[PDB]
RNA sequence: ACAU
DNA sequence: CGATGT
């Protein structure tokens, strides 16, 4: 229906898919960048979106914030709900770094709790997510 | 088909 | 036009 303005929005950016992956989280209302991940040399769009949501969860928990997280990624939202990132990216020395981060993000989800609602950004109705690149 |  | 996903 309507945007929950008191929220954190995340977004992935990439150069290639697979290719260089980065992500950031922003205040949905103001656009203020709240966190930005150093670019990861090789990963997929969906791994980046997954890592972005999990980082937002950890960021909000550490700050005792009950704000929801918006993501436009059907895939990543489901991976977080499942606590399992079902990526097809091969595992090799080239992809070790992103797979390490993804493996660690799943481990974190399996060892911590949170009530943070994870919400679908309705691009069709609201336009591009505010964390856009 | 939908979400990227 | 290609790729990542449910
Ligand atoms: Ca975007
Ligand atoms: K996105
Ligand atoms: K983007
Ligand atoms: K497809």
Quick take:
This protein has 133 residues and is of the alpha/beta class. The protein has four helices and six strands, in the order ββββαβααβα.
How does this model look, in words?
With 133 residues, the chain is an alpha/beta fold. Helices cover 35% and strands 24% of the residues. It has helices at 45-62, 74-82, 96-111, 123-126; strands spanning 8-16, 19-27, 33-36, 40-43, 69-71, 118-120. A hairpin with a 5-residue loop joins strand 2 and strand 3. Helix 1 (45-62) crosses helix 2 and helix 1 (45-62) packs across helix 3. The protein starts with 7 loop residues before the first strand and ends in a 7-residue tail after the last helix. The structure holds a DNA/RNA duplex (4 and 6 nucleotides). It is classed as hydrolase/rna/dna. Keywords: in crystallo catalysis, divalent cations. Crystal Structure of Bacillus Halodurans Ribonuclease H1 in Complex with an RNA/DNA Hybrid (1.54 Angstrom wavelength): Soak in 0.5 mM EGTA and 200 mM K+ at 21 C. The protein: Ribonuclease H.
Secondary-structure element order, as H and E?
EEEEHEHHEH
Work out the count of structural domains. Answer: 1
Distance between the termini: 25 Å
The CATH architecture classification is 2-Layer Sandwich
Structural class: alpha/beta
Tell me the major beta sheet.
6 strands, mixed
Hetero groups:
calcium ion, potassium ion
EC number: 3.1.26.4
Organism: Halalkalibacterium halodurans (strain ATCC BAA-125 / DSM 18197 / FERM 7344 / JCM 9153 / C-125) (Bacillus halodurans)
Binding site for Mg(2+) 2: 11, 49, 72
Domain RNase H type-1: 1-133
């Amino acid at each position: 229906e309507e945007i929950i303005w008191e929220s954190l929005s995340v977004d992935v950016g990439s150069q290639g898919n697979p290719g260089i992956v980065e992500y950031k989280g922003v205040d949905t209302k103001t656009g203020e960048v709240l966190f930005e991940r150093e670019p990861i040399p090789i990963g997929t769009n969906n791994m980046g979106e997954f890592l972005a949501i999990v980082h937002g969860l950890r960021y909000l928990k550490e700050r005792n914030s009950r704000k929801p997280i918006y993501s436009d990624s059907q895939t990543a939202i489901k991976w977080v709900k499942d606590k399992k990132a079902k990526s097809t990216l091969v595992r090799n020395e080239e992809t070790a770094l992103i797979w390490k981060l993804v493996d660690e993000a799943e481990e974190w989800l399996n060892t911590h709790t949170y009530e943070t609602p994870i919400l679908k950004w309705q691009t069709d109705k609201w336009g591009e997510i505010k964390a856009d690149y």
